[PDB]
Amino acid sequence: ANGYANSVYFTNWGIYDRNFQPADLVASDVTHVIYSFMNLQADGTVISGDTYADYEKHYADDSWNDVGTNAYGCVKQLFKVKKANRGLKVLLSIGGWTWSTNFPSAASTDANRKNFAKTAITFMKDWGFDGIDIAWAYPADATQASNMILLLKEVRSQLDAYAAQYAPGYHFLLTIAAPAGKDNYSKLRLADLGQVLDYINLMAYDYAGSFSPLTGHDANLFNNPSNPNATPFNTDSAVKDYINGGVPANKIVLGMPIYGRSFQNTAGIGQTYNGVGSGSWEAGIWDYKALPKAGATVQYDSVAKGYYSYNSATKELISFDTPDMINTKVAYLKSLGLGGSMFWEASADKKGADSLIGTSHRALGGLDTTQNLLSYPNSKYDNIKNGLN
Ligand SMILES: CC(=O)N[C@@H]1[C@@H](O)[C@H](O[C@@H]2O[C@H](CO)[C@@H](O[C@@H]3O[C@H](CO)[C@@H](O[C@@H]4O[C@H](CO)[C@@H](O)[C@H](O)[C@H]4NC(C)=O)[C@H](O)[C@H]3NC(C)=O)[C@H](O)[C@H]2NC(C)=O)[C@@H](CO)O[C@H]1O
Ligand SMILES: CC(=O)N[C@@H]1[C@@H](O)[C@H](O[C@@H]2O[C@H](CO)[C@@H](O)[C@H](O)[C@H]2NC(C)=O)[C@@H](CO)O[C@H]1O
Ligand SMILES: [Zn+2]
Ligand SMILES: [Zn+2]
Ligand SMILES: [Zn+2]
Numbered sequence: 001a002n003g004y005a006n007s008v009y010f011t012n013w014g015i016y017d018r019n020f021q022p023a024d025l026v027a028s029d030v031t032h033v034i035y036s037f038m039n040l041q042a043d044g045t046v047i048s049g050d051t052y053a054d055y056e057k058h059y060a061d062d063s064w065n066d067v068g069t070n071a072y073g074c075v076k077q078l079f080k081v082k083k084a085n086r087g088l089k090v091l092l093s094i095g096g097w098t099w100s101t102n103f104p105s106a107a108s109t110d111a112n113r114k115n116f117a118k119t120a121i122t123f124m125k126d127w128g129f130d131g132i133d134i135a136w137a138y139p140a141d142a143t144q145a146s147n148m149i150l151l152l153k154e155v156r157s158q159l160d161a162y163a164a165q166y167a168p169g170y171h172f173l174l175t176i177a178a179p180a181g182k183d184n185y186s187k188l189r190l191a192d193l194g195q196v197l198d199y200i201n202l203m204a205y206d207y208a209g210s211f212s213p214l215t216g217h218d219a220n221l222f223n224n225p226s227n228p229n230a231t232p233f234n235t236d237s238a239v240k241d242y243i244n245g246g247v248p249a250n251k252i253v254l255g256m257p258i259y260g261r262s263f264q265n266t267a268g269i270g271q272t273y274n275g276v277g278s279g280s281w282e283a284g285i286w287d288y289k290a291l292p293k294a295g296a297t298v299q300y301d302s303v304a305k306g307y308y309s310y311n312s313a314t315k316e317l318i319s320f321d322t323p324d325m326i327n328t329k330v331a332y333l334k335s336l337g338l339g340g341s342m343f344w345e346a347s348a349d350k351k352g353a354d355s356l357i358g359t360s361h362r363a364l365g366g367l368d369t370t371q372n373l374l375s376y377p378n379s380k381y382d383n384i385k386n387g388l389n
């Protein structure tokens with residue numbers, strides 16, 4: 001890369017209720033769009049989890065009078081984004097939190113690995129994408145951790161062979177979503193990941209929610225020793241462990257939530273609570289663009305480095321990131337020589353000054369400008385093959 005990553009997860013299910021289409025991305029703020037998620041079978045077969053969202057949906061300019069086999073849905077919409085934003089690379093993300101059960105099996109044999117790599121890369125070269133993100137949540141033991149490395153080396157090796165025939169000189173990106181929890185990351189082959197991958201998207205959030213006994217900061221930088229119940233986890237320990245484990249700092253992209261976690265029937269941060277309540281689309285999770293709510297006031301834990309909102313009238317607290325938090329996390333990641341910012345996820349962001357991804361872009365300054373690929377001469381989609389010309 002020739003500068004900081006400013007990367008955002010784009011969810012293919014975001015096109016429905018959330019009505020967030022690839023054209024809605026503020027592409028000028030983004031170095032990498034990570035397209036989420038592909039599903040996975042136990043025999044390593046990577047599959048579309050939604051073929052309509054992925055390549056069948058016709059947008060206002062998608063004609064049914066097109067000759068040949070053509071890609072539509074988000075695939076064509078993201079290729080349009082790639083054409084208008086040559087510094088924007090699009091990565092295919094496989095698995096995610098709900099679709100990781102088949103990873104151990106998928107990685108367990110040379111045959112399954114070879115099948116995973118081949119089917120993954122097929123979608124990538126057919127859809128006109130710049131690389132593959134593997135979001136296996138998570139390797140549970142030494143066998144799975146070793147096999148994850150064997151899987152990534154199979155994918156790297158097949159990407160390079162694909163490039164050598166159909167995109168000579170182009171470097172396809174290989175990335176992972178990485179856990180911030182020591183229970184999880186202590187099992188990874190960190191030094192192997194640091195060697196084989198372009199980026200580790202550190203998922204430095206989901207520290208506290210319905211799964212927590214007490215209200216907690218969702219994505220704090222540091223431990224609060226004068227209120228440790230408020231910081232069950234901290235990003236700093238995770239980042240240091242990844243670097244000292246042998247992931248080069250510059251390959252670590254700091255993940256940041258574009259949503260908050262709500263706590264109801266609670267006194268405050270570090271305190272006892274009863275239920276997360278309602279959410280934006282799902283119980284106890286609020287889109288950052290729905291935050292802070294009318295009435296609630298944003299307090300800042302300056303030790304933990306984590307903002308939250310509390311309604312003293314309704315006793316609701318919501319851990320979420322503000323623009324100011326983004327500026328602090330960017331100052332932080334630049335201090336440790338990290339590779340940039342990652343966001344989960346695009347649909348929940350505000351527009352203008354108050355955009356978390358926008359704020360990250362200005363804070364980082366010199367974004368990665370490495371050129372994307374528009375040449376897919378082996379795509380089974382004529383429109384992709386012809387670069388939508
Ligand atoms: C990089 C990585 O590991 N990512 C972590 C994420 O896994 C995690 O984000 C959560 O991701 C899960 C999927 O893994 C996602 O689950 C989705 O839930 C939504 C419901 O909100 C479903 O959306 C519906 O889909 C149907 C059709 O499929 C639509 O018709 C309907 O309109 C949708 N409903 C709404 C309201 O939009 C998705 O189907 C489902 N996806 C899958 C594949 O199961 C969670 O929503 C994500 N959670 C959050 C908080 O965003 C993330 C944060 O915890 O951490 C990532 O880094
Ligand atoms: C820091 C840590 O390990 N916390 C765990 C949480 O990560 C985890 O929540 C889940 O974490 C994933 C991010 O790494 C998300 O993809 C996923 O959406 C999220 N699960 C939920 C509840 O949204 C919880 C599991 O309940 O465990 C913590 O220990
Ligand atoms: Zn709906
Ligand atoms: Zn059609
Ligand atoms: Zn290379």
Ligand SMILES: [Zn+2]
Binds near residue numbers: 198
């Ligand atoms: Zn590389």
Ligand SMILES: [Zn+2]
Binds near residue numbers: 361365367
């Ligand atoms: Zn810029």
